[PDB]
């Protein structure tokens, strides 16, 4: 048996001094990057004055020398011209030029476009939207699109659409692309280069999401290579033509974590690319991709380099960008290979391609600091510091200086000097975009210095997919502001260097960018992650990890007076059964009872300690776990079966939850929010830690002492959660730890003295619970709360608009991490008809590119399911869908699988949802096809299963998300993004229905179901009225129900029925927040006055109610305005007439305890029930809380999905 | 400038459905749609789904979707104000049908 | 000024929508009040006018 993480994630290769250096620059402080770039980047002052004149000189050129012209001729509006744009891309999508002009004249032309061309015309439109307005939209309004798009032909007809044809045709096949093939690219670069350019071919290939996809970029390359070589003809590496190539395209797992099938398969692809190039001597150049792939990319760059089958070739190149703190130290690194090799590198300097999403990345990942600069003339300096390196070594390597900023041009032009031969170093520039700034350099009668362009190669379909990164021409961009006429030439020639070299702190980070760790600002610190590309990181995790997995970890009850003896058993690692991680002592059902009743005496000494120094404990809980996060990640890791970026992920989660608690705790509670008293928190197995830290974090901050009950299957993290929370000030008699089974469990929750049950688990459990508790009343008389966060059968509805590669990557996420066991896994995929056959050959082709196994390995994928009885349950699943014939895909798994329980990830291709009948808690995901005018009948199916936890939808159109968003009843929506980890305050989570009873965890609402009078949440309150409570209210009035309807006209005001917020978190993501109502009420009224109260309650949060007939007060609801008789049913049979959303009850305590016993027995979802006396109707306006009669819903989404953040632009 | 009830027949003087009244085909106004849909006018497309009804049912999602209905703009104007301009549901409409099939298309009509 | 805003708004309406396809009602009767004598006359008259009816 393998020793636990001796084989974690050991590097490619031993790191040398100078690769070291890389690793220690990787998110170093802006303010130390800056100031020796700002001496490396210095020159005299005749230097300066002479660069400033030649960037004046080009500027002046760039200004006294499209689109534009076709909208001012026609004169379109904006979503005019973006309309046209996008139906000449269809239209150019037919291939015979006869029957397109047939069509335009005929169809097109003369009505009804609509009806002649399952795909949205639109589906581009951000694109176009880029190329007409300069802004971007990450989706598209398709209806303001279509009207629009009517409005212009039937204003213009045939003349406009031809124009929109004839201009989409020339900026799709010539402007944005050299060429449709790499022989039309190449007969047209003749031109350009007899004028002295060279070029660069980019075959727009990346992001391999198959081993197919892999394979057919790599024979494009190829065949490129070939075509290149060929009209090369021997011209060289420097005066010919070269090629660009992109790592990700030539493997669907580049990445750190990868690093060995990297080194093994994706290695040798670019060696023998590398070798056709070289017999062509042609450049070859390694594009510069994500942050976290830099320096695995080096590892590459090595071997390649140090190979002898590439010796006598100098075309090998390799962008370095400067946006990124570590470039200097990469380019030491580059000239000592070129020196030790040899060869001389072929080094493109660029500024960096991929700001927004590593801005992005860098705050999802709580990582210390980000990788690339935050202000844009941190970047320009950065570029001219690296270049002024590069010019000092021509001799080893061949600087390659891509930009198209006059400025830094001029700089670098001055700075290189007078002596020149080609072969020193070039310019380069992007085709159709940097040929008017470069004319005025090349050639004999300008400043006589080369640039090659980089000319994108493809069809329509490829260029589209990621021009908007291309495009974003954003606000801080040279071509942006050149094209500015408020911006004068001497803003434009302004000196980088000396503007950093006077700022008063240089370098200082962006004022308007917050560090990952500041996301929150003053409410709460935001939790810290770890980088697992960090090679420093991963040495030190090794360390820590092998250091958890010699700790011998026990758990035991953990009662007020000490630890209690039990019956004593291993815990064992559900990957390798061998592995054994500790010991627990079960707590015995006598011992249960007795730590209850502990509890209950030390209640009132816990109360005692004021709500912020609870809250301080939880805080100093938060500090211990993030110190401890490496030991505890071990722990989880193996007891749990979680990957390491699972494991992080959860501890943080933790860290969450106590600072959001704290921080919700002192904004709300003071003396009047008096505490429930005892409170049982049973947790599951498979967020052992942070659910098991969130529920007891809320109920002790609460004011309530804690019984803290742990899953069967994962003690140990528990009892460490325990002993931290302890170490932090929480007293012994607050929180008390009972491992054990469902029995222990069930023996907190009977226990006289049990005050409120918090769980989390399955829906057939918490009916369980449910049903006992509905033989128990408080000492008031009142329910004894319980908040129960359940199961669910999420699904996930994809369009023909989608981005395949975007969809299939949430997909495998969403579906498999974890191997399915989140509560909010993916379940169900519905796939649009006409997208679905291509959707699913990727899907499967990505399901075999994961590694299953035990997770002590960085290169693991998906890990062991729990339990063999997971297992099992899962696998019975799987086989009768096959028995039933539908289709099943599986990867294999290895047979060192056989030690533990494990899963191999499945895809079941089902006829319709109801093929689907309970939540399968495991790596087994569901597919659907649906025509897109069943989509409304789509959304009723996903309903129809009772459940409402997570829902995903990806579509680019406005009409599909206002559509699905409105009819979708679920509690966690996702728009264009994975549905899985959802954050603390961010994506407050929990659902309804058969998903569970609110209110949400990591959510404002929660503190006040752990108090016995509920506080006003931040930020929790509503401006609109419920219009059926306002007319009920008057049909009060007008039946003499004068305190009533003042009573109903308080609720339609207290009501927070309609709140809309958006909650702070990362750049390139809105988190929303809304309060709805939670459908029907049960209403179980004694009295006239107590009906009245009930059904104001009712309506003030936009409910629907069903009235007990049993009750006899029909009479009482006599005349009812046909608005407040919509909402209004009798019912005679409630199980009949459910599901409801809630109930409420007026009566005694035998009358509250015998409702409450039918409610427990009706089918389906828990019900929130609140109960009040007559008495208490008339005394407490607050009878009923109108918190619980409301529904949260968090919906987040991605506005980076275009393929850009257009807010950061600015 | 423009109300309803007792106070006219609309469309407003000054706003962008005017002129489509003075010509027997109304043009789309500029600005004019909405990205929101019915949704008694859903409820209605399926129900007509499942009777067969198939090109009712086609013609009420059609509706559903080029009705502006929730329209809802800003104007320009002067600074210091805000200037609103949305289209909501009329009330009851009056259907005056002569068969099945003219009965469904003028209920889509009013739903959407 | 109404009167002017009218005769301009209605222009640039037209501008922005009427094609081949949205053909004239015919002759349009425009009855006006003392009230705007100008403006609502103008108003009513002009938006007749540019959508292609003849006014009485
Ligand atoms: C000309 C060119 C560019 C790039 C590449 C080749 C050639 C010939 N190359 C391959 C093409 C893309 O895949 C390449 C690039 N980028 C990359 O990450 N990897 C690659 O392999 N190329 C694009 C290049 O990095 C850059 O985006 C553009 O050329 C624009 O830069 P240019 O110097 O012409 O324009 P400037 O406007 O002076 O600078 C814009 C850049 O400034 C940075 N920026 C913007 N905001 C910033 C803030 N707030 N903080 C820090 N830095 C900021 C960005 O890097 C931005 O692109
Ligand atoms: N909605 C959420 O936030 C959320 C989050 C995580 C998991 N879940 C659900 O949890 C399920 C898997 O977790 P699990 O397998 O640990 O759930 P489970 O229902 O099998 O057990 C959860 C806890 O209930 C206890 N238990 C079992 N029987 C009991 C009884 N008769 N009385 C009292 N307690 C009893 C168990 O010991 C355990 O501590 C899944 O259904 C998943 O959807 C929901
Ligand atoms: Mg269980």
């Given at each position: 048996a393998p020793a636990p993480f001796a084989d974690f994630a050991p590097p490619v290769r031993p790191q040398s001094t100078l690769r070291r250096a890389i690793t220690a620059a990787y998110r170093r402080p802006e303010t130390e990057c800056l100031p020796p770039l700002v001496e490396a980047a210095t020159q005299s002052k005749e230097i300066r004055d002479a660069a400033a004149s030649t960037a004046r000189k080009l500027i002046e050129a760039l200004r006294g020398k499209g689109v534009e012209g076709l909208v001012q001729e026609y004169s379109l509006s904006s979503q005019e011209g973006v309309a046209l744009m996008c139906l000449a891309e269809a239209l150019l999508r037919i291939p015979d030029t006869a029957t397109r002009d047939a069509l335009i004249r005929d169809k097109i032309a003369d009505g009804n476009w609509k009806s002649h061309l399952s795909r949205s015309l639109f589906v581009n439109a951000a694109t176009w939207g880029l190329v007409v307005t300069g802004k971007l939209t990450s989706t598209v309004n398709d209806r303001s699109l279509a009207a629009a798009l009517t409005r212009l032909i039937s204003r213009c007809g045939e003349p406009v659409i031809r124009r929109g044809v004839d201009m989409a045709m020339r900026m799709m096949g010539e402007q944005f692309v050299t060429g449709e093939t790499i022989r039309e690219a190449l007969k047209r670069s003749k031109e350009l280069e007899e004028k002295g350019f060279s070029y660069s071919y980019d075959m727009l290939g990346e992001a391999a999401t198959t081993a197919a996809d892999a394979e057919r970029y790599y024979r494009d390359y190829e065949s490129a290579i070939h075509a290149i070589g060929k009209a090369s003809a021997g011209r060289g590496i420097y005066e010919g033509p070269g090629i660009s190539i992109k790592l990700s395209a030539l493997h669907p797992r580049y990445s750190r974590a990868q690093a060995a099938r990297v080194m093994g398969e994706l290695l040798p692809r670019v060696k023998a690319l590398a070798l056709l190039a070289k017999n062509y001597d042609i450049g070859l150049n390694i594009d510069a991709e994500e942050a976290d792939r830099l320096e695995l990319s080096l590892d590459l760059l090595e071997v390649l380099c140090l190979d002898?089958?590439?010796?006598?070739?100098?075309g090998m190149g390799f962008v370095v960008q400067?946006?990124?703190?570590?470039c200097p130290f990469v380019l030491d690194f580059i000239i000592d290979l070129a020196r030790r090799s040899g060869r001389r590198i072929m080094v493109r300097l660029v500024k960096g391609a991929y700001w927004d999403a590593e801005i992005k990345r860098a705050q999802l990942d709580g990582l210390a600091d980000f990788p690339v600069f935050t202000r844009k003339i941190h970047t320009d300096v950065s570029y001219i510091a690296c270049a002024a390196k590069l010019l000092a070594a021509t001799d080893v390597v061949f600087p390659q200086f891509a930009t198209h900023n006059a400025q830094t041009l001029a700089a670098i032009y001055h700075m290189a000097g007078k002596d020149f031969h080609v072969g020193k170093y070039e310019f380069q520039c992007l085709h159709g975009m940097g040929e008017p700034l470069y004319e005025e350099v090349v050639g004999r009668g300008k400043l006589d210095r080369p640039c090659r362009i980089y000319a994108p190669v493809g069809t329509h379909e490829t260029l589209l997919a990621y021009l908007v990164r291309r495009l974003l021409g954003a606000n801080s961009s040279f071509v942006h502001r050149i094209n500015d006429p408020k911006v004068s030439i001497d803003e434009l020639i302004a000196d980088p260097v000396e503007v950093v070299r006077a700022m008063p702190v240089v370098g200082a980070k962006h004022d308007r960018i917050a560090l990952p760790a500041e996301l929150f600002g003053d409410a709460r610190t935001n939790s810290a992650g770890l980088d697992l590309s960090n090679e420093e990181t991963l040495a030190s995790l090794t360390e820590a990890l092998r250091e958890s997995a010699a700790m011998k970890w026990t758990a035991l009850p953990q009662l007020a007076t000490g630890p209690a003896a039990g019956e004593t058993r291993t815990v064992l690692n559900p990957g390798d059964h061998r592995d054994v991680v500790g010991s627990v002592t079960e707590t015995s059902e006598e011992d249960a009872r007795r730590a209850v009743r502990l509890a209950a005496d030390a209640a009132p000494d816990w109360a005692a300690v004021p709500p912020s120094e609870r809250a301080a404990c939880l805080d100093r809980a938060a500090e211990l776990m993030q110190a401890r996060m490496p030991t505890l990640l071990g722990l989880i890791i193996r007891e749990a079966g979680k990957s390491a970026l699972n494991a992080i992920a959860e501890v943080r989660e933790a860290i969450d939850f106590l600072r959001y608690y704290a921080e919700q705790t002192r904004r709300t509670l003071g003396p009047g929010h008096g505490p429930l008293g005892p409170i049982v928190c049973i947790s599951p197995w498979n967020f052992p830690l942070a659910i098991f830290t969130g529920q007891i974090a809320a109920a002790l901050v609460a004011g309530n002492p804690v019984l803290a009950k742990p899953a069967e299957e994962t003690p140990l993290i528990a009892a460490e959660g325990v002993r931290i929370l302890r170490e932090a000030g929480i007293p012994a008699s607050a929180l008390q730890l009972l491992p054990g089974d469902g029995r222990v469990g069930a023996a907190l929750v009977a226990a006289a003295e049990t005050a409120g049950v918090m769980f989390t688990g399955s829906t057939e459990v918490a009916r369980l619970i449910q049903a006992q508790l509905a033989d128990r009343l408080s000492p008031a008389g009142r329910p004894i709360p319980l908040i129960a966060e359940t199961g669910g059968q999420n699904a996930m509805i994809v369009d023909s608009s989608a981005l395949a590669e975007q969809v299939v990557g949430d997909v495998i996420t969403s579906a498999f991490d974890s191997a399915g066991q989140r509560a909010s896994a993916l379940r169900v995929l519905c796939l649009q008809e006409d997208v679905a056959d291509r959707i699913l050959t990727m899907l499967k082709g990505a399901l075999h590119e994961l590694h299953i196994g035990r997770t002590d390995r960085l290169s693991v994928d998906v890990g062991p399911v729990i339990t063999s009885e997971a297992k099992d349950n899962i696998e019975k699943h799987i086989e009768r869908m096959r028995g039933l014939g539908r289709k099943v895909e599986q990867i294999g798994l290895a047979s060192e699988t056989g030690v533990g329980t494990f899963v191999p990830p499945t895809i079941i291709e089902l006829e319709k949802l109801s093929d689907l009948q309970r939540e399968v808690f495991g790596p087994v995901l569901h597919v659907i096809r649906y025509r897109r005018d069943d989509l409304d009948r789509l959304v009723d199916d996903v309903n129809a299963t009772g459940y409402g936890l997570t829902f995903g939808l990806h579509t680019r159109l406005d009409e599909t998300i206002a559509h699905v968003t409105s009819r979708i009843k679920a509690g966690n929506l996702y728009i264009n993004?994975?549905?899985?980890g959802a954050v603390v305050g961010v994506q407050p989570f929990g659902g309804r229905g058969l998903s569970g009873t609110g209110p949400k965890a990591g959510g404002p609402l929660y503190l006040g179901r752990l108090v016995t009078t509920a506080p006003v949440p931040p930020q929790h309150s509503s401006v609109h009225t419920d219009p059926v409570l306002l007319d009920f209210a008057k049909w009060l009035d007008g039946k003499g129900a004068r305190a009533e309807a003042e009573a109903a006209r308080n609720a339609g005001s207290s009501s927070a029925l309609g709140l809309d917020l958006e909650l702070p978190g990362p750049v390139g993501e809105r988190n929303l927040y809304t309060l709805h109502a939670r459908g029907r009420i049960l209403l179980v009224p004694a009295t006239e006055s107590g009906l009245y109260h009930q059904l104001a309650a009712a309506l003030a949060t936009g409910n629907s109610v069903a009235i007990?007939?049993?009750?006899?007060?029909?009479?009482?609801?006599?005349?009812?305005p046909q608005t407040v008789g919509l909402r209004v049913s009798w019912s005679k049979d409630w199980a009949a007439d459910g599901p409801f959303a809630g109930a409420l009850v007026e009566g005694d305590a035998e009358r509250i305890r015998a409702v409450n016993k039918a409610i427990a027995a009706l089918p389906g979802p828990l019900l929130l029930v609140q109960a009040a006396s007559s008495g208490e109707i008339a005394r407490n306006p607050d009878a009923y809380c109108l918190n619980w009669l409301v529904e949260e819903v968090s919906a987040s989404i991605n506005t980076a999905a275009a393929g850009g953040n257009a807010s950061l632009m600015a």
């Open positions: 002898g089958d590439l010796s006598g070739w100098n400067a946006y990124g703190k570590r993004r994975n549905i899985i007990d007939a049993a009750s006899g007060l029909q009479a009482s609801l006599k005349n009812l």
